[PDB]
Design a protein around this ligand. Structure first.
Ligand SMILES: CCCCCCCCCCCCCCCC(=O)O
Length: 108
């Protein structure tokens, strides 16, 4: 850990969402991927680590952790992929955080 579990997580979510490596690789400069399929990849990551609220569909950011946590953890849209994308946009606003998760999941 942490590299072995995250690689395991990346391969399943590429397959489920149907997002290309090119679409996800946009994260390398700190950008949160925007493809309709890459937004679903993010939902897949939250679903596999069990941080998607059964009752509301909101992302349980406090659980994910192990001032901004509260607002970003109450975002709910009619689309599961849009909900996950909007939550990441809200919470991981700094370029450095996106890059760190990008490297952990996406590179060898
Ligand atoms: C690259 C997408 C944008 C920002 C990142 C979104 C949050 C993804 C969270 C996945 C973290 C994986 C770490 C799991 C490690 C473990 O369980 O031991």
């Amino acid at each position: 850990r942490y590299k072995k579990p995250a690689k395991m997580l990346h391969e399943i979510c590429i397959a489920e969402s149907g997002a290309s490596e090119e679409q996800l690789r946009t994260c390398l400069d700190g950008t949160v991927p925007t493809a309709p399929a890459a937004k679903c990849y993010i939902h897949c990551l939250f679903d596999k680590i069990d941080v998607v609220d059964e009752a509301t569909g909101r992302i349980l950011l406090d659980r994910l952790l192990y001032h901004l946590t509260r607002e970003c953890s109450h975002i709910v849209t009619p689309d599961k992929c849009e909900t996950a994308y909007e939550t990441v946009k809200c919470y991981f606003n700094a370029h450095d955080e996106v890059i760190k998760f990008c490297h952990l999941l996406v590179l060898e």
